[PDB]
Each structure stands twice: as structure tokens, then as C-alpha cells.
């Protein structure tokens, strides 16, 4: 595509520069270009890909929430009619968000997931698949909402099955997957009890494995464990 003429290594280098400059749209475009070279991604490169799109979609989600709240208020009793503009602009932002999600899901399907054989890579990409279907579910209101939710669930579940077989309970990818799948249960699937159970079991199994870790690995795992605890505190 647009980045077809730039070297893979140059795209990676520029993604890192874009991150330093907080230019996340550029970062995402560079990493899309790097994926489309067709080679597998290293650990570092996978994290550049995820950081870039997380920041782009994160801004879109925040904007969508603002606009949705204004729209909800416009449709309350006693609200004066202001015309189609709030709905139109919310729809514009929504369409852009859906486009970013479709872009990410497209990269995963063509062909990151199918070439990922190691547990660390495969779980990482399946977590991404679940996350981006979750973002589509957040804005879905139509005939496909159930199918979108089931697509998220299925991706998370495959990732969980691999992670439990192949990774220690303190592995950061495994922990972050569980954190996000727990949020899926609470916020998307209307299953708060499942969310709470998953967060608690994950935390406790990680606690019991901390003794095996170096100082630096301990720091990484305990950071994510604290996010599990934070959600449990929010929900209980």
C-alpha cells in the first residue's frame, strides 16, 4: 500500500520516532506498512503495533463516549430539538472507529494469526482480536451485535486456553489477557459474577507463582496484578 516503497527496517525506525513524538496515527500507519511486508513480527515489533492502535482507538472511544452522552441528553424529556447534527457527528466518529477496528482485525486475519505458532505470539494476537471485537461491540446496536460479542468471546477464549496450557500464571501477556477478558464479561457480556471470579482466580494463581521470579519480572507481574485488584475493588 502507501508504505509499499519504504524499507521494513525504516518503517520500524519511524514507528519508534512517532511514538517519541506522540504521533500515534503516523505510528499506526508505519506499523501497518511493516505488517504488510509479510514477515512475522518480533516481540518488540508486536508491542509497537499494539501501542500505536491502542492510542488511536483509545482517542476515538473517548470522543465517541462524549458525543453519545450529549446525544442521550438530547433525547430526554424537556430537551429542545437541535436537529440531526449531534447524531450525524456521533455517527461520523463511530464510522471512523469501526474503520480502525476493521483495519486491525484485517491485519490479524491477513496473516498474523495464522503464522503465529509460539504461544507468546499467538496469545498476543488473539487478545488483540478479542479487544478490537470488544471495541466494535461497545458501539453496536443492530442485528449483528450478538455475533460481534460472540466473535470477541471466541477469540478471548482461544487465547485463554493456550495461555493456561503454555504460559506461567505470572506471565504478563496471560495476566493482561485475563484482565481484559474479565472486563469483557463485566461491561459487554452482562456477566459481572464471571468477571469477578476470573479476576480473583487470576490474581490468586499469580500470587502463588511470584516466588519463582527475578526482581524485574516480579515488578512487571505485580503491576498488572494491581490492575486486577483495582477492578475487583471497583466491582465489590
Amino acid at each position: 500500500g502507501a508504505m509499499g516503497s519504504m524499507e521494513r527496517a525504516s518503517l520500524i525506525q519511524k514507528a519508534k520516532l512517532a511514538e517519541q513524538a506522540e504521533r500515534y496515527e503516523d505510528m499506526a500507519a508505519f506499523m501497518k506498512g511493516a505488517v504488510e511486508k509479510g514477515e512475522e513480527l518480533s516481540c518488540e515489533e508486536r508491542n509497537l503495533l499494539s501501542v500505536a492502535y491502542k492510542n488511536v482507538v483509545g482517542g476515538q472511544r473517548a470522543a465517541w463516549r462524549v458525543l453519545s452522552s450529549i446525544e442521550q441528553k438530547s433525547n430526554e424529556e424537556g430537551s429542545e430539538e437541535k436537529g440531526p447534527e449531534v447524531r450525524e457527528y456521533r455517527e461520523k466518529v463511530e464510522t471512523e472507529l469501526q474503520g480502525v477496528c476493521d483495519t486491525v482485525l484485517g491485519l490479524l486475519d491477513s496473516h498474523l494469526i495464522k503464522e503465529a505458532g509460539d504461544a507468546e505470539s499467538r496469545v498476543f494476537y488473539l487478545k488483540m482480536k478479542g479487544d478490537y471485537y470488544r471495541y466494535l461491540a461497545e458501539v453496536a446496536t443492530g442485528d449483528d451485535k450478538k455475533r460481534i460479542i460472540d466473535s470477541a468471546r471466541s477469540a478471548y477464549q482461544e487465547a485463554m486456553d493456550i495461555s493456561k496450557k503454555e504460559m506461567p500464571p505470572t506471565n504478563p501477556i496471560r495476566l493482561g489477557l485475563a484482565l481484559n477478558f474479565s472486563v469483557f464479561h463485566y461491561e459487554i457480556a452482562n456477566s459481572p459474577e464471571e468477571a469477578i471470579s476470573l479476576a480473583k482466580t487470576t490474581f490468586d494463581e499469580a500470587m502463588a507463582d511470584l516466588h519463582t521470579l527475578s526482581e524485574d519480572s516480579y515488578k512487571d507481574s505485580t503491576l498488572i496484578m494491581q490492575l486486577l485488584r483495582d477492578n475487583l475493588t471497583l466491582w465489590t
Binding site: 493482561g176 484482565l179 481484559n180 472486563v183 463485566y186 461491561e187 498488572i224 490492575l227 477492578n231 471497583l234
Partner: peptide
């Protein structure tokens, strides 16, 4: 909103 990574 709850924490995700």
C-alpha cells in the same frame, strides 16, 4: 471505567 491493557 475499569482498567484494561
Amino acid at each position: 471505567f475499569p482498567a484494561t491493557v
